[PDB]
Amino acid sequence: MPNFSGNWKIIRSENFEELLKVLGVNVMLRKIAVAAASKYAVEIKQEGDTFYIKVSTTVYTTEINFKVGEEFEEQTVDGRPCKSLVKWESENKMVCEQKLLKGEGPKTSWTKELTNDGELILTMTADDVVCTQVFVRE
Known part of the structure; x- marks a missing residue:
């Protein structure tokens, strides 16, 4: 059953820095972040239109919980x-x-997509800037 459910490890991270540049993150951090970002892991438990996503690096980890269509x-x-x-x-x-x-600032979005060759593709926009990350099943 080829759904988003699984454990993914990053393999490519085009343009991550530019996103963070655009979000006003200073150079030193941007670079520390870009290095961090080679060990992104995404665990996805997906049932119907309901999503558990755990997103970890070496030192940080977050779980977001969402149903599609629900703010x-x-x-x-x-x-x-x-x-x-x-x-x-x-x-x-x-x-x-x-x-x-609260606050003001750039237009952020994100998409997740499963390719027909079994990669996970995350894109993350901030204004004119588009970061793409490709994950593969652990």
């Missing part, structure tokens, strides 16, 4: 709290618009 709360990538809401684009592509609780 929920998470943080951006730069870790600002936001109102998020996911919708399907197709059989195995969902996309999430984030709107900031």
Whole structure:
């Protein structure tokens, strides 16, 4: 049953720095982050339109819980709290618009997609900037 359910390890991370640049993260941190980001692991437990996603690195880990179509709360990538809401684009592509609780700043989004060759593809937008990360089953 080829659904999002599984354990994924990152294999590619195009443009991560630029996203963080755009979110106003200073150089030194951006680089410390980019190094961190080679050990991204995503565990996904998916039943119907309901999603458990654990996202860990070597030292940090978060679990978000969501049903598609139901507004929920998470943080951006730069870790600002936001109102998020996911919708399907197709059989195995969902996309999430984030709107900031407090504060002002860039237009953040994220999508998860399963390719027909069994990779997980995460894209994360902030304004004009698009970061892509590809994961494979652990």
